[PDB]
């Protein structure tokens, strides 16, 4: 299974007028840790994308989406919104219906005009999953589901959302052999984005 | 699951003398244990005092013999009726056989 070769996990949650997206940092071949500094989260303006799966496919999709977002900004004279970027990701994935990318992309953002946080997840062929609470992806998806269905609350301040998402990520990663060599969290508001690196057991 | 090949049996023998050559062949054609024919020649005179026999799968051998005879005809057409020697015929047959490197004729050839 190509999706379970390199490992890695990504979570996303909505809190009040804010959003949060977190990822692990491990990159390994099969069971040997190669790199602890492999970030799975990228941003194109104010839209954030986290990709799990094959590291090559992650890098390729990041480069392709940077290409497409730059061209979109040049033609439209405005940055792309999360809701339209979700459709773009879905179409890009479905264009490879038979030779698909083995990826787990997750989109998180805040709509500039409306101010409403937005979150979505995708399978490898571009099926869209819209959620008002959270989205998980990676080799530890079941552990993430278990953590999120218990820790999440419908409305949290960013300070509380940080603790919730960080604890969910850490406790799901400590039960996955292929995940966890460091962890990054992004807290995203209308006019501020904070990035925090967590402390972890490593092994 | 089609198996485009066959066996057809047969046995041929070539011997070179000081001033002569001999090519002999069986005339029996069989499929597995039945006799298709008791007189089906497999040794032919392919012009310019050259004799040829391609033993094995009969269809491939017949196709190869027909192609070599046509090659002799076109060699005569394109080179002012020059006689095709035996080494040149051997090289031409090598090229004819290697032209089907990945779907070969299933025959052993003697000229």
């Amino acid at each position: 299974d190509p999706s379970s070769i390199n490992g890695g996990i990504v979570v996303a949650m909505t809190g009040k007028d804010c959003v949060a997206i977190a990822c692990d940092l491990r990159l390994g071949s099969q069971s040997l840790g190669v790199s602890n500094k492999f970030e799975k989260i990228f941003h194109y303006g104010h839209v954030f994308l986290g990709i799990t799966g094959l590291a090559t496919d992650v890098t390729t999709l990041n480069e392709m989406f940077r290409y497409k977002t730059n061209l979109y900004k040049l033609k439209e004279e405005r940055a792309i919104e999360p809701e339209t970027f979700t459709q773009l990701v879905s179409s890009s994935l479905y264009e490879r219906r038979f030779g698909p990318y083995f990826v787990g992309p997750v989109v998180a953002g805040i709509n500039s005009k409306s101010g409403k946080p937005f979150i979505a997840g995708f399978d490898l062929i571009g099926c869209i999953d819209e959620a008002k609470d959270f989205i998980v992806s990676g080799t530890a998806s079941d552990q993430l589901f278990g953590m999120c269905e218990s820790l999440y609350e419908p409305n949290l301040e960013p300070e509380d959302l940080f603790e919730t998402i960080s604890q969910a990520l850490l406790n799901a990663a400590d039960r996955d052999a292929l995940s966890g060599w460091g962890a990054v969290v992004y807290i995203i508001k209308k006019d501020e984005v904070v990035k925090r690196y967590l402390k972890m057991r490593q092994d | 699951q089609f198996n485009p090949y066959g066996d057809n049996g047969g046995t041929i023998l070539g011997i070179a003398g000081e001033d002569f050559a001999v090519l002999a062949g069986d005339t029996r054609n069989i499929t597995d244990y039945s006799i298709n024919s008791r007189y089906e020649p497999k040794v032919f005179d392919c012009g310019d005092n050259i004799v040829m026999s391609a033993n094995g799968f009969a269809a491939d051998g017949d196709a190869l013999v027909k192609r070599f005879k046509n090659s002799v005809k076109w060699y005569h057409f394109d080179h002012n009726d020059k006689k095709l020697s035996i080494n040149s015929a051997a090289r031409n047959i090598q090229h004819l056989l290697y032209g089907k490197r990945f779907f070969p004729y299933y025959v052993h050839t003697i000229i």
Binding site: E63, M64, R66, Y67, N70, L71, L74 | -
Partner: protein, 243 residues
């Protein structure tokens, strides 16, 4: 057959000239003037609007953006220019995807020039009747100014003009230009040259397009600013045109 109707757009003349290229240059010589000036700390592009100068013309045609560090001024047919600009944008994005770095200005300019030359040599299609003034920044040479014509030749300039009054503008720019000028001095010189070469009663804000490429201004290393009509009016008042 169709041999009678062929005009043979890619053949030499007995003097060794290409008729279609010369005719396209003559066509360009009747378009709105564009001027590029490079100072020690930035680049100024100024295009004088010529067509569609009417009161009921919303600004919402001559200045375009290629990437975050390269912009162009257009003289000639607008639609052919848009075709070439789309190709250039795709090329810049391809270079960024391949090498994970911003494309040097000269590489993109040379690619566009090769595209232009191809129509001149092979095929039976007319050349592009467009001239470009490129203004860009890269880590190799810093600020760079180029021009390209339908002949496929590209040239780097300290100060250049393309359009209806290239001779007069170039004569004006040969003087009053120094290698140690600043961005504000370059803006003033470009506006003065446009005012002196304009064949109109006054140089108003609604017949101009302005752009600058410099460092800072609520950005990082390099910022591209495309002036709004109000900004153009303020600049005209400040310089001394007051029109």
């Amino acid at each position: 057959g169709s041999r009678r109707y062929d005009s043979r757009t890619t053949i030499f003349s007995p003097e060794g000239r290409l008729y279609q290229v010369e005719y396209a240059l003559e066509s360009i010589s009747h378009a709105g003037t564009a001027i590029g000036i490079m100072a020690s700390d930035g680049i100024v592009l100024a295009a004088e609007r010529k067509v569609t100068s009417t009161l009921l013309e919303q600004d919402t045609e001559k200045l375009y953006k290629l990437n975050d560090k390269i912009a162009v001024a257009v003289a000639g047919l607008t639609a052919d220019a848009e075709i070439l600009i789309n190709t250039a944008r795709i090329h810049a994005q391809n270079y960024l995807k391949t090498y994970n770095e911003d494309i040097p200005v000269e590489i993109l300019v040379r690619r566009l020039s090769d595209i232009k030359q191809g129509y001149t040599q092979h095929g039976g299609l007319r050349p592009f009747g467009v001239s470009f003034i490129y203004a860009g920044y890269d880590d190799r040479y810093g600020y760079q100014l180029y021009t390209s014509n339908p002949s496929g030749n590209y040239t780097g300039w300290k100060a250049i003009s393309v359009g209806a009054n290239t001779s007069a503008a170039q004569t004006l720019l040969q003087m009053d230009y120094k290698d140690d000028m600043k961005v504000d001095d370059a803006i003033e010189l470009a506006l003065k040259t446009l005012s002196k070469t304009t064949d109109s009663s006054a140089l108003t804000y609604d017949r101009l397009e302005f752009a600058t490429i410099r460092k800072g201004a609520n950005d990082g290393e390099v910022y591209q600013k495309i002036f709004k009509p109000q900004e153009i009016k303020d600049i005209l008042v400040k310089t001394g045109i007051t029109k």
